[PDB]
Every structure is written in C-alpha cells, then in structure tokens.
Amino acid sequence: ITLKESGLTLVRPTQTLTLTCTFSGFSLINSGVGVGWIRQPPGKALEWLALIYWDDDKRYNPSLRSRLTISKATSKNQVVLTMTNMDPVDTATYYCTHRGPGHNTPIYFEFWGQGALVTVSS
Amino acid sequence: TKCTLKSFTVEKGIYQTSNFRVQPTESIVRFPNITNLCPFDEVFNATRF
C-alpha cells in the first residue's frame, strides 16, 4: 500500500487549492477502508482536513467545514480535495492518509502520503 | 471330508468338499469426479452487509 499526492503547489491568494491522492494497494469498495487528508504548517502541529469512509460517509473538520469539498474517482483509484479562497496562512504540507481495518477495530491513518508543499503567495 | 460325509470311514473316491473364492484386497473410493461448488466466498467475504 502506497499513496501519492499531486496538484498545484503554488497558488495565488483568493484562489483554490486542489489535491489528488492517487494510491495503490487498496480499493475504496471494501468495508472499513476510507481515505482522509491531513495538513501540517511549517513548524506547527498537525491538522485534520476531511475523511471519507467506504460507504461514502464524508466526515469534515467542523471548524474547516463550509470551505472544503472531497470527492472520489474510484475508477481512477484517486481522491480529490478542494479548498477555495486560499490564504498565506494555508502555506503548509499536505499529506493524504489511509484508514483501513485492523484485527478487532478499524485503523485510522495507518499509511501516509509523501506531502505536497503548498505555498499561497505571489 | 469326514465332516461332509458324517462318517469316520471314507471309502476310495473323489468328493466335492467345499468352495473357495478369492477375497477383495481393496476398496476404491466410490467416487464420481467433481468440479465446482456454489457461492460461499461471496456471502461470508462480502464487502458490505
């Protein structure tokens, strides 16, 4: 199981950030499986963006709701994250992470991406 | 031979005392040959219940 992010790493303010986690080794059709996104600013603590279970249960970070949209292209084995009205405070590293099943309870964030440095500037 | 004739003295001659029959040495699993089952790994390994 491998994950990899992609999108635009540089975007102007008042624009939108898009990211695509393309994975290999699991399918969002089995039970348990879900995919989420987690950001971390440079030199700050981690931050949770959004989550999507296998039955399409789109959990969001409440404080970060009303700005985010996550969607799937299962045919392409990929997940899309979108955040509008980007700002200089949103300069961070963005990981796409995977939550699957364990041995007696669902696992969360067992696998991480490799990040995608996102700068919001000019 | 005495047992068949029920007599302690048997006279000269030829007598048919008994029969023999070679016994089976083995059993051969009694089977036709199969090929396929039904859907069980599609009812217990189902993705969503």
Side-chain angles (χ1 to χ4, degrees), chain A, chain B residues 1-20 22-24 26-30 32-33 35-49:
Chain A
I1 295 186
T2 172
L3 302 175
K4 299 296 319 182
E5 310 167 269
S6 43
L8 49 87
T9 70
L10 322 179
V11 76
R12 282 311 80 74
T14 303
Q15 226 314 311
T16 306
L17 180 70
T18 69
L19 283 75
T20 304
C21 182
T22 40
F23 48 91
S24 316
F26 62 99
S27 54
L28 195 46
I29 74 160
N30 308 277
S31 190
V33 69
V35 187
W37 288 79
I38 183 183
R39 92 174 171 182
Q40 160 177 31
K44 192 244 159 184
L46 310 180
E47 187 172 23
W48 175 64
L49 310 191
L51 190 46
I52 167 164
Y53 289 96
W54 73 106
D55 64 9
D56 290 318
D57 176 4
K58 294 290 216 168
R59 318 263 199 205
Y60 290 105
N61 195 352
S63 299
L64 204 68
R65 198 37 186 101
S66 198
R67 205 199 219 172
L68 284 49
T69 174
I70 182 160
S71 314
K72 292 311 163 282
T74 78
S75 63
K76 182 185 171 283
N77 271 296
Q78 76 78 39
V79 319
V80 294
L81 209 72
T82 301
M83 201 156 148
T84 44
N85 278 146
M86 287 311 308
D87 295 77
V89 78
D90 292 80
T91 73
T93 64
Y94 293 73
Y95 309 94
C96 69
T97 51
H98 157 70
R99 72 159 295 272
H103 70 266
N104 187 204
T105 198
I107 305 318
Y108 275 73
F109 314 135
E110 61 275 14
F111 303 113
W112 292 66
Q114 283 280 24
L117 182 151
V118 166
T119 304
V120 177
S121 47
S122 191
Chain B
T1 308
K2 291 175 180 183
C3 294
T4 80
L5 301 170
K6 298 196 189 296
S7 170
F8 275 56
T9 53
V10 308
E11 293 75 11
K12 176 173 72 177
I14 175 173
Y15 309 96
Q16 187 170 346
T17 190
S18 90
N19 305 278
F20 80 106
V22 301
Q23 302 300 292
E26 187 156 13
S27 180
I28 58 177
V29 205
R30 183 24 262 151
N33 77 300
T35 284
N36 76 329
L37 188 133
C38 24
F40 276 168
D41 208 0
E42 296 81 357
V43 73
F44 274 145
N45 195 34
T47 182
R48 82 197 170 178
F49 269 68

